[PDB]
Design a protein around this ligand. Structure first.
Ligand SMILES: *[C@@H]1O[C@H](CO)[C@@H](O[C@@H]2O[C@H](CO)[C@@H](O[C@@H]3O[C@H](CO)[C@@H](O)[C@H](O)[C@@H]3O)[C@H](O)[C@H]2NC(C)=O)[C@H](O)[C@H]1NC(C)=O
Ligand SMILES: *[C@@H]1O[C@H](CO)[C@@H](O[C@@H]2O[C@H](CO)[C@@H](O)[C@H](O)[C@H]2NC(C)=O)[C@H](O)[C@H]1NC(C)=O
Ligand SMILES: [Cu+2]
Ligand SMILES: [Cu+2]
Ligand SMILES: [Cu+2]
Ligand SMILES: [Cu+2]
Length: 534
């Protein structure tokens, strides 16, 4: 249907690469003698000239940019990030893909007010994977994410680096953060405020840029796909502009939680909100050609319900040189890793129905705001459970996300007989797409940390109004590991604290090296992640 946003000069602006975020300090952990990397991120308003010949867009971003800066953290290095709210609305940061403790996970009511900050303590112990950090504040998550509070967080491992996949952040390892937005006649964003069904967007962005292009060499690139859109799901394919409907083969090497067991040979990649898929595309057969990354129409070929617009079939263009300047020394091995699948369970699956209750998006008839009713599962730490995730509706779809865990996709049924489990769903994930009339069973190890965690639809419009609930990963009173201060996301110890802008700017007061060092060493003494040691 007709594009609403003004006409954009397609494929004329180079793909931006978010800069790598550097830590301010390292602090010695007195428990283990190891360095904890300490970072500061200031959440603040900024404007960005999206349309060349119109006015600017109003954004609020991590370090005043969108996407936020990219974190790059080696497995085994703990990090503390001081997220500083210098904006106009509260925030709650979630590191999506991280088994963070309840109070460091972005619980939706665990907000930071403007003129406050919160120290998030991250474990960085899980398998190499593409995480992303983004806003999770109750009621306002869609608008906070839409206006720019999302960025990438790459957990690296020299074992994955030894596979010799295409490498170098911004060289042959390229972030591909997909969003879908709408702009006014004067080039400002159309707000998501007021939208209660879905905010599709008619302008496709990669790394914050409408319909960009990139010059590539005829060799292999790693692409880290992330659907950071408010409501838009994609069906991605590559085509030569000389044969724009002919899909070119590629390999999926990783899902939300890390590498697949083997690359999945693929010409079409379904990716819904919050899903990450890493792809190796080989441009060697397309020297001197232009390859367009495109998006399936027909509401992702009958899987979705998303509205299609004039240019939502287009993502970006790659212009391929005639030759490489350096040898392609990268490979995609047939055997990537042994995926650490959870134990199979014979426990009867729990059922969660994703539907509407009057005008409100609900789980088993419940809204997250309803404290009394929203705790839907008590799961002893170490238990494996199958959850049967049910979309009974034909008129909407739900990418379902479960905090804490990585899960195996066991089964998909479709009331439209459309599809079962995809080859790139063979590994471990933390989001799975319930297409039209789809039921998915997932299997997860509820481990290794006790606490109260969220699960929800990651259509941010549905999540906000109000398709989200909680489970409690429970322990017996003799468990240890300071569980008493780590199970409650609202624990006073870990709450946001006020700051004065002056001290932040001067790096004085509670921003002094001494104050930060004492705060982190005190946090580290509680040993938040000890239960995951090996
Ligand atoms: C989620 O599960 C956790 C347990 O994994 C729950 O925390 C536990 O809450 C129980 C009941 O409040 C506590 O036991 C009680 O302790 C008090 C005070 O010492 C005592 O007077 C009672 O007779 C009883 O023994 C338990 O200590 C606590 N455990 C931990 C590790 O914090 C938590 O309540 C659950 N959260 C929700 C919202 O259900
Ligand atoms: C639970 O957290 C407490 C408080 O941080 C830890 O106790 C401290 O242990 C340190 C060693 O880093 C001592 O020097 C402090 O004097 C302790 N403070 C108190 C009040 O005990 C404790 O080690 C943690 N326990 C576990 C199991 O992680
Ligand atoms: Cu998320
Ligand atoms: Cu998450
Ligand atoms: Cu939904
Ligand atoms: Cu969440």
């Amino acid at each position: 249907v007709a594009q609403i946003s003004p006409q954009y000069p397609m494929f004329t602006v180079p793909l931006p690469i978010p800069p790598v975020k550097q830590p301010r300090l390292t602090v010695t952990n007195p428990v283990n003698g190891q360095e904890i990397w300490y970072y500061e991120v200031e959440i603040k308003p900024f404007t960005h000239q999206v349309y060349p010949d119109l006015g600017s867009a109003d954004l609020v971003g991590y370090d005043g940019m969108s996407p936020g800066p990219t974190f790059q953290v080696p497995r085994g290095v703990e990090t503390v990030v001081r997220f500083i709210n210098n904006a106009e609305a509260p925030n709650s940061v979630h590191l999506h893909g991280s088994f963070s403790r309840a109070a460091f996970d972005g619980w939706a009511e665990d907000i930071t007010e403007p003129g406050s900050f919160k120290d998030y303590y991250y474990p960085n112990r899980q398998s190499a994977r593409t995480l992303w950090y983004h806003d999770h504040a109750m009621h306002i998550t869609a608008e906070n994410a839409y206006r720019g509070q999302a960025g990438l967080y790459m957990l690296t491992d020299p074992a994955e680096d030894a596979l010799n996949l295409p490498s170098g952040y911004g060289e042959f390892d390229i972030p591909m953060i997909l969003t879908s937005k709408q702009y006014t006649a004067n080039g400002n964003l159309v707000t998501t405020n007021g939208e209660l069904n879905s905010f599709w967007g008619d302008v496709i962005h990669v790394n914050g840029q409408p319909w960009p292009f990139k010059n590539v060499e005829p060799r292999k690139y790693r692409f880290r796909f992330l659907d950071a859109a408010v409501s838009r799901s994609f069906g991605l394919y590559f085509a030569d502009t000389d044969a724009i409907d002919t899909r070119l083969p590629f390999k999926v090497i990783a899902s939300d939680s890390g590498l697949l067991e083997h690359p999945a040979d693929t010409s079409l990649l379904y990716i819904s909100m919050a899903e990450r898929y890493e792809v190796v595309f080989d441009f060697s057969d397309y020297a001197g050609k232009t390859i367009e990354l495109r998006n399936l129409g027909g509401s992702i070929g009958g899987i979705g319900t998303d509205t299609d617009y004039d240019n939502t079939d287009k993502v970006m263009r790659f212009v391929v040189a005639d030759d490489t300047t350096q040898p392609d020394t990268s490979v995609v091995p047939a055997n990537l890793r042994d995926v650490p699948f959870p134990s199979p369970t014979t426990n009867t699956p729990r059922q969660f129905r994703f539907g509407r209750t009057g005008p409100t998006w609900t789980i088993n008839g419940v809204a997250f705001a309803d404290v009394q009713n929203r705790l839907l599962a008590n799961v002893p730490v170490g238990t494996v459970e199958r959850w049967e995730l049910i979309n009974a509706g034909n008129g909407f779809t739900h990418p379902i996300h479960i905090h804490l865990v990585d899960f195996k996709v066991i089964s998909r049924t479709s009331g439209n007989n459309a599809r079962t489990v995809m080859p790139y769903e063979s590994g471990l994930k933390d989001v799975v797409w319930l297409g039209r009339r789809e039921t998915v069973v997932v299997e997860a190890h509820y481990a290794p940390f006790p606490g109260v965690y969220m699960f929800h639809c990651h259509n941010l419009i549905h999540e906000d109004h109000d398709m989200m609930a909680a489970f409690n990963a429970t322990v017996l009173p003799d468990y240890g590991y300071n569980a008493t201060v780590f199970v409650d996301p609202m624990e006073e110890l870990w709450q946001a604290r006020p700051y004065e802008l002056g001290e932040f700017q001067a790096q004085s007061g509670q921003f002094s090296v001494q104050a930060v060092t004492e705060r982190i060493q005190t946090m580290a003494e509680y040993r938040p992640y000890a239960a995951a040691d090996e």
